Structures are given as C-alpha cells and as structure tokens.
Design an enzyme around this catalytic site. Sequence first.
Site, PDB file in Angstrom:
ATOM      1  N   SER A 113       0.275  -0.698  -0.310  1.00 50.38           N
ATOM      2  CA  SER A 113      -0.370  -0.220   0.032  1.00 50.38           C
ATOM      3  C   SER A 113       1.191   1.845   0.243  1.00 50.38           C
ATOM      4  CB  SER A 113      -0.974  -0.099   1.692  1.00 50.38           C
ATOM      5  OG  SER A 113      -2.264   0.910   1.144  1.00 50.38           O
TER       6      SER A 113
ATOM      7  N   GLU B  93      -9.058  -5.621  -3.941  1.00 50.10           N
ATOM      8  CA  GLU B  93      -8.227  -3.766  -3.779  1.00 50.10           C
ATOM      9  C   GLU B  93      -9.272  -2.541  -2.748  1.00 50.10           C
ATOM     10  OE1 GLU B  93      -5.107  -4.404  -2.843  1.00 50.10           O
ATOM     11  OE2 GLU B  93      -4.381  -5.348  -4.240  1.00 50.10           O
TER      12      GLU B  93
ATOM     13  N   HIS C  32      -7.375  -5.992   0.193  1.00 56.43           N
ATOM     14  CA  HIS C  32      -6.248  -6.033   0.584  1.00 56.43           C
ATOM     15  C   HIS C  32      -5.420  -5.441   1.587  1.00 56.43           C
ATOM     16  CE1 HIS C  32      -3.996  -1.706  -0.964  1.00 56.43           C
ATOM     17  NE2 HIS C  32      -3.771  -1.342   0.250  1.00 56.43           N
TER      18      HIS C  32
END
EC number: 3.1.1.7
Length: 533
Positions: free
Chosen positions: A197, A324, A437
């Site tokens: 991320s 995601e 995610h």
Amino acid sequence: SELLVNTKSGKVMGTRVPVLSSHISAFLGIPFAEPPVGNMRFRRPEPKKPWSGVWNASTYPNNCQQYVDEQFPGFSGSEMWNPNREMSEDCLYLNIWVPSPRPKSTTVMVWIYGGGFYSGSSTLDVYNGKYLAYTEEVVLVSLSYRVGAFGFLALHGSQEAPGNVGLLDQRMALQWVHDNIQFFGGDPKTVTIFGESAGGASVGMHILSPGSRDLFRRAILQSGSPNCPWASVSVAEGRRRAVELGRNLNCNLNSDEELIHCLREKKPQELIDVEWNVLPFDSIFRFSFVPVIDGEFFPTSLESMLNSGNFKKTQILLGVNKDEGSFFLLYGAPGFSKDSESKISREDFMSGVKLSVPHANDLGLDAVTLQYTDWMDDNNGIKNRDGLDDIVGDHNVICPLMHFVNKYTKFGNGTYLYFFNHRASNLVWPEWMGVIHGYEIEFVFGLPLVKELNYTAEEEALSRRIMHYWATFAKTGNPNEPHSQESKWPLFTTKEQKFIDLNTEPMKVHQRLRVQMCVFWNQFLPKLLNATA
Ligand SMILES: CN(C)c1ccc(-c2sc3cc(O)ccc3[n+]2C)cc1
Ligand SMILES: *[C@@H]1O[C@H](CO)[C@@H](O)[C@H](O)[C@H]1NC(C)=O
Ligand SMILES: *[C@@H]1O[C@H](CO)[C@@H](O)[C@H](O)[C@H]1NC(C)=O
Ligand SMILES: *[C@H]1O[C@H](CO)[C@@H](O)[C@H](O)[C@H]1NC(C)=O
Ligand SMILES: [Mg+2]
Ligand SMILES: [Mg+2]
C-alpha cells in the site's frame, strides 16, 4: 556474544528469540534519528547523535502518532492494524532480525509498512521479521516513518514544514541500514526495499527520487504504486490542506511562520481529531497528508519522470490482490455491512461511484457507471457490490500499478508481476470482501508457518513458496530457482505482459492484467475529465 553489536552510532544489546523450535537475534528499537519532537515537528529529520553506553534493543519501540481505527471495537480484523505500542512523536526507530549463527554479507530486506500515509506501525504482529529472517536466512529490517500531519504536512516554500519529511525518515533509515547493516551480518550492496500500500508507493517513490536511488539494490511493490491517485498532491493542494488544518484549529493563517507555531503548540491528538476535515471531497481511498510533488524530492512530475526513464533502473517484483477495493467500501460507502453480504442497491451504487471518483464531473461519473454497469441485470445487488469493488480497486490500485509496470519495463532490467488471489482460511472478515487489500502480507512474512495461527497445510505451502520467491529475488534479481523443474515465473515484458497468480493451486501464466478496464482509467477517463472541466 552475537547479541552485542557496535554501530557508527553506538552499541546495541539485542535479544535471542524463539522462532519455530529454534532461535535468531533480534534488535528492536534501534534509533536512527533524533526525536522529531517539539521544535523538530514537521522539520526534516536530523541523524541520531551517537549515544554513549549500550543501547537496549530488546523490545519493540513506540509507534508514531496516528488516527486509530475504532469502527469495529474488539474485532481483530480491523484492530490488527492499530498501533500496538504507546503512540508518541518520538517514534523514529527500526527493527533488525538476524539469523544464528550470525552470517556475513547476506541479503538484506527492509520493510516499509503502509497505511495510506496516515497510519502505520513497524511492530504489528503481521510484520514480525523473525519468520522470514529465519526461513530464508536474510537480515530483515523494518523501518518507521512519520505519518499524518506529522510526516507530510506541506507548506511548500517553508524550511520548517517542507513536506515529504515522512519519506525523508524512510531515507535516513535506508541510509543508516547502509552504514550499519554489515555489523549485523548484512550486505549493504544487496538491500531490497519492500512495502505494501503506502509502503509500496513509498518503495516506488524511492525508485524515482534521486536522493534515494543509491541506497538499495532491487525492490518489491505490493498493492501500491508511486503514481497512485491517493499517493500525492500538488504543492498547491498541499498548502491548501495545510492552511485548512490550521483554520480547523483556530490558527493565525496570515503567514507560514505563524501557522507552523500554532500547529506546533497543539497536542498530537488535537491535530489528529481534525485530520480528515481537510480532504476536499466526501470520499473513500483518499487521505489528507501525503507526499507532495515538491520539485526537490521529486525532480519533475511523476508521469514525466516515468516517461523519460528518469529513475533507478534495476529488477523489481510487484503485484496486486483480487479485491483491492472491498476494504475501503466497507468503511465509507453506503449499503455495505460487515454483518451481511452487502447487496448494493442501484441508488447506493450511484452514491458509491461518486465517493470513489470525487474529482470527477457529472459526465465522468456517467462514463464510470456505463463502463461498470450491466444493463441486462442492473438491479442485481451482487453485481453492483462487486462493481464497486472493481471500481475502487482498478482506479486506486491495479490500474495505477499497471501504468507503472509498463512505464517502468521500458528502462528497467527485469520485471516480475503477480496476481495474489488466495482467500485465507481463517480470514475473520465476511466473504463478499474476498481477497482483501493488504491481506497478502501475512503470507509474505510467513505467519502461516505458525501452527497456533491455525492455517491449513496448503497455506503454509504457499507462504513458504512466496517467501522463497521474495527472498530469492532480493538475493538474485529473479524469483525462480537457478535450475529447478518447478514452473518458472515468467519475466514481464512490454510485448507479452505475462504475470502469474499467487494461490494454492499450481502456477498459471496469464497475460495483460485488467488491460480492458485499465485503458479506461489510464487513458479515456482522464482524457474526458480534462477536456470537460
Ligand atoms: C484498514 N483500512 C484499509 C481503512 C481504515 C480506515 C479508513 C477511514 S477512511 C475515513 C474518512 C473519514 O472522513 C474519517 C475516518 C476514516 N477512516 C477511519 C479507511 C481504510
Ligand atoms: C532493557 O535492557 C535491560 C538490561 O539492562 C533489561 O533488563 C530490560 O528488560 C530491557 N527492556 C526493558 C524491560 O526496559
Ligand atoms: C540486465 O542487464 C544485463 C547487463 O547489463 C543484461 O545482460 C540483461 O539482458 C538485462 N536484463 C534484462 C531482462 O533487462
Ligand atoms: C488457533 O487460534 C485460536 C484463537 O485464539 C487459539 O486460541 C488456538 O491456539 C487455536 N485454536 C484452536 C485451539 O483450535
Ligand atoms: Mg501561540
Ligand atoms: Mg471483486
């Protein structure tokens, strides 16, 4: 005594810790910068003045000041990312995990945690380097950087609050590892930076930034690209939000110097409580303080740097996860719930879309809906739900990373792309959320190898396989074995654009990741938005 090390900053007393019926050295809380407290707040980071005596690095350090997620109290699912140590402005420390016996000139791997640049911790259970270190015999390092206003507040022009200081902390850490990882048996010439991320965008920003290029060898990016919509703002937008924070705390807004004093006299929590009020639009997957396109750390625009090749050229290994967007939808989109399968209504869908592309005009929103709506079954609550997942996912992660891949694979020295699509067996989140995610991290760090964590035999398989690819890459610049019969992970090329998926089943080679939807995000929409604003 392998627990005693002398570094160009002072001595460090480690600690021997258990790791799957065996042990390895651990040096937690090694400081690499002077406490960014008081007058230091918002300023660049200055190096830690060498300390006298022996520094005790046997227990994780404090975490940086940040927003804490209390949306689902007592729910490990969300609380596993929360700080698990006392928050404090004094948080510029790093962790080292060294095998035993201590090897020499061995592969180093520095982890950069994510969290949208607003949250993070190098001490989460899921970032425990001991497993990785032990299993692949590498010196795993987990750094830390300031997040939130504290690490990215940007009043470009000032020298007291320039912005990007957060990215600077990660540098100083990468610097320190450089001039010190050898004493711990590390090889400063085989350092591989990896993060997920915001961490992934970070890695990629270090690939771009000239002042960082010479501090690592190859690199890995997980669910995050430097050109992500949410990874940065213009100096203008950053200054706006900067002033905005002050206005939200009744500050003198007349001059930068006045604003900086005010924000420095306010308590960490006073800044955190209004952090979110500066975002220009009601939306999801958008965070207030993040990297600013300053002109220094970032020479020119990101697209220009990528198009001209102005960036460290080496081998890189990156990828995304199947869903995601589900995480973010759950926290800020209407219709979603953690206690049901969240079938999204048509009215909610429209809402959800606008919350995902807040900078889009009415036409842009229509283009997005047409593109992701099945007019032969538009009321299907399941399709709308998944639709948003793909929208948020493609717009915020997959497509950006894809744009990067290509732009990179034109000057680089090797690319390995992956598609993590394995749905953990002990996942605590609902099922519609799919492969969430950031949930591919536990496998990269070998948490499945733990029997008490209750993972299926096949999942320990995968985790071990992934750890190998990863470490093998760092060490050789290629995840595949030197000459095994195991199926190879193709090299990504501009022509064939091959990638593999990471799951339990036997490897499969696919081509052109979400190419279709990504033409929409990288070309059309932007083109539309610009011509119609
Ligand atoms: C764990 N993950 C992925 C996560 C956790 C929290 C959030 C958000 S977005 C947001 C927006 C706002 O105006 C207030 C609070 C707030 N919070 C907490 C987004 C993703
Ligand atoms: C720090 O090192 C000392 C050794 O002098 C040790 O007793 C202590 O447990 C370590 N961490 C703590 C508890 O502060
Ligand atoms: C990487 O560089 C080496 C030597 O400069 C070259 O031989 C090799 O083809 C390159 N690898 C790739 C896949 O670009
Ligand atoms: C795996 O996870 C639970 C959750 O805390 C843990 O207590 C236990 O060791 C395992 N569960 C069992 C006993 O099957
Ligand atoms: Mg005052
Ligand atoms: Mg989906």
